[PDB]
């Protein structure tokens, strides 16, 4: 059953992906949901079809939709408190206002919870874990999504005792949750916008590990430096630590012995601990970082008692999450054909890994160039990590640097996309005209090339565009 406060829930910004998933879980567990949204979308249409009362635009009257007033009001992170009319009315009536993580935590209460968190790779690892659990015939509840924006976001109310969730760390949401199994992909020095320091950002993961239930497990990647530091710290605390990575050791639970990309997909020889011989793990997604994500999902799945062999079988079916090297399309056929992929990489490590995966897919292709179209994400992040972005993009045969993506951030003087292009030693261009990109990439294309659109903003739209301009060139 639902808690008393989650009985009648009014949601400001119910069209959002995470909010839509939360609303559907509530509606499936017997609760009444009303809501409001500034912009009409098809998700609002779906929730209306599921009996939710949604008003387009915000108003105090929305709090009179549910019978007997709303027991709670959930709000999105983009809503502004003392100015949104509905939050003002809700605080004027004494109605509680909460964020999505609090409602998610209340929804995960009685179940065995498996959180996945880290600087990046959360949605991919969470999706791998969900698919592995479902391939074993389980039907867990889940709420994946957040890191890749709205890509990969999906929630579901299952009939089982498990609850998989992606837990964001850039806003202090980790402290809202109580994991039975906590997975930590990596801890990098980024997303420090909310913490003001690096020590605070690492202390948030420390406090998250403190929140694990007694008897629970911390799956963690020890190839990442911060991840290995946290593994050691949590081992001192007498907490079950399941380490996974490439470097071997006397405390490894799952060691990546070898990895090789082939045409079908990749094959990785892995080694598991005796409590959990050398096994083979075949994957359909490209890239060596996908092997580590699969190992994390595998450890998390076996901890709750799923057989590792058929969990590997399930991981072998994973075809990927949107904007995780998602194949946009192709012009031509066989060899001498140009393929267009779309990735969400906005961290220098993400960029390097995506470009390495593209290089590996291109190498055993008997000829081709790696052309990337990078769009830096934030003004502050670009002003900070411009040299990192450029040196990362150096792993491509040609670079196209778009302009900086706003993302509601205040424009900094002297900062633009060219701030990254300064540090690009490979052949590159600067194309701030977003309309002129699709043509210039297609004109610069050549048979057998691997084109990647990379960034966390508008760039995802150029994917199909580059394809069209490529088919126009078919003369
Ligand atoms: C991951 C992502 O990119 N977006 C998520 C971000 O919200 P975030 O605050 O980014 O919300 P966005 O601006 O992206 O918009 C998401 C939804 O918010 C609605 N909206 C927004 C502003 C506003 O003043 N009024 C309003 O109703 C929009 O109509 C939209 O449907 O965290 C929310 C969780 O709390 C998620 O549910 C949102 O999907
Ligand atoms: Zn990020």
UniProtKB/Swiss-Prot annotation:
Keywords: ATP-binding, Cell cycle, Cell division, Cell shape, Cell wall biogenesis/degradation, Cytoplasm, Ligase, Nucleotide-binding, Peptidoglycan synthesis. GO terms for molecular function: ATP binding; UDP-N-acetylmuramate-L-alanine ligase activity. The keyword Ligase applies. It is an enzyme of class 6 (ligase). Gene3D superfamilies: Mur ligase, C-terminal domain, Mur-like, catalytic domain, NAD(P)-binding Rossmann-like Domain. Its main location: cytoplasm. It is found in: Cytoplasm. One of its GO terms (cellular component) is cytoplasm. It catalyses: UDP-N-acetyl-alpha-D-muramate + L-alanine + ATP = UDP-N-acetyl-alpha-D-muramoyl-L-alanine + ADP + phosphate + H(+). Its EC number is 6.3.2.8. ATP binds at residues 118-124. The keyword Cell division applies. Pathway: Cell wall biogenesis; peptidoglycan biosynthesis. Pfam families: Mur_ligase, Mur_ligase_C, Mur_ligase_M. One of its GO terms (biological process) is peptidoglycan biosynthetic process. NCBIfam families: murC. Cell wall formation. Belongs to the MurCDEF family. This is UDP-N-acetylmuramate--L-alanine ligase.
